[PDB]
Amino acid sequence: ETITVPTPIKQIFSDDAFAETIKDNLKKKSVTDAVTQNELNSIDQIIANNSDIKSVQGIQYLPNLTSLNLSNNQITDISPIQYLPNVTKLFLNGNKLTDIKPLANLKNLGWLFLDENKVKDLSSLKDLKKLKSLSLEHNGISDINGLVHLPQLESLYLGNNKITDITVLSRLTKLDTLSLEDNQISDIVPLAGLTKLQNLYLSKNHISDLRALAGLKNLDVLELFSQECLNKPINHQSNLVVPNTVKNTDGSLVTPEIISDDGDYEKPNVKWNEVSFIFYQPVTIGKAKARFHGRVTQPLK
């Protein structure tokens, strides 16, 4: 798309706030000032954080735009971005996005930041062969199966979601930085062969078994605290015996730190409507030191 006659900024960029962004970027005096396509072609970078932007309609007239920061606005639709082929950096944190199908077209996208939106389907990212860094925290996401075809990603932040199944991650063999903190993950076996991983954030999941991590020799940063592990319910009895299922990287059992209701440990079992125990174990994997810590809860029926 091109404009062929000088046109007031507000007629092209229909959201007042975005119109103000373009006016400021071109150093104009008013959103009623006329712009030409030549002036719009001069826009290589937009910095428009914190601007109450509700729509980026009109942005399709910025062919040379390579970096676009729309953090912390109120945007609901990013379709006008889809035909901007030179965009390589896209900051969309803190908006109201649900659909990211229009990003499928951004073949040169390199960095994409989408935290604090409501994007729940990621299959739209499969086209993106130059995507190196993706952040999708706090989106309410459960299904990450669309991340199959970004096998060249280097950094992926998926913390603070509703993820249980990380099967697809075994294909993301270029990852050096991965966050899955504050999800619902118990099975970390899909990580076991991802030997390039350097930085791995796994706190606040449901992880009780570290065997999956035993071969990750390039780890430098590792976080493993505040797990919450929920056993399947068992019948209440006067004398309760529950196998300890908490395991170190070498498969040895982690001795409980504290056991509820004055219970005690007789290895491999913890003995006493619910009981629980807490564990805390410093671990080292490669150069990475972490504290493996959490609680196992046993409901009783």
UniProtKB/Swiss-Prot annotation:
Effect of gene knockout: Deletion of inlB alone decreases host cell entry; the reduction varies from 99% to 37% depending on the cell line tested.
Residue windows of the LRR repeats: 40-62, 63-108, 110-128, 129-150, 151-174, 176-194, 195-218
Superkingdom of the source species: Bacteria
Subcellular compartments: Secreted; Cytoplasm; Cell membrane
Domain annotation LRRCT: ranges: 228-301
Annotated region described as Ig-like region, given as residue ranges: 228-300
Domain LRRNT residue range list: 1-41
Subunit relationships: Interacts via its LRR repeats plus the Ig-like region with the extracellular portion (residues 25-741) of its receptor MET; MET can bind HGF, its endogenous ligand, and InlB simultaneously. Probably forms a dimer upon interaction with host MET, which subsequently allows dimerization of the host MET and subsequent host signaling; dimerization probably occurs via the convex surface of InlB. Prevention of dimerization does not block interaction with MET but prevents downstream action.
UniProt comment concerning the protein's domains: The N-terminus (36-79) resembles a truncated EF hand, the LRR region (80-240) has a curved form, while residues 241-321 form an Ig-like region; the whole region forms a curved tube. The LRR domain alone (31-241) binds mammalian MET and stimulates its Tyr-phosphorylation; the LRR plus Ig-like region (36-321) are required for receptor dimerization; adding the B-repeat allows the protein to scatter host cell colonies, and the GW domains, especially GW2 and GW3, potentiate MET activation.
Homology family: Belongs to the internalin family.
Function comment: Mediates the entry of L.monocytogenes into normally non-phagocytic mammalian host cells. Its host receptor is hepatocyte growth factor receptor (HGF receptor, a tyrosine kinase, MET) which is tyrosine-phosphorylated in response to InlB. Downstream targets MAPK1/MAPK3 (Erk1/2) and AKT are phosphorylated in response to InlB, which also causes cell colony scattering. Complement component 1 Q subcomponent-binding protein (gC1q-R, C1QBP) has been suggested to also act an InlB receptor, but this is less certain.
Listed name of the protein: Internalin B
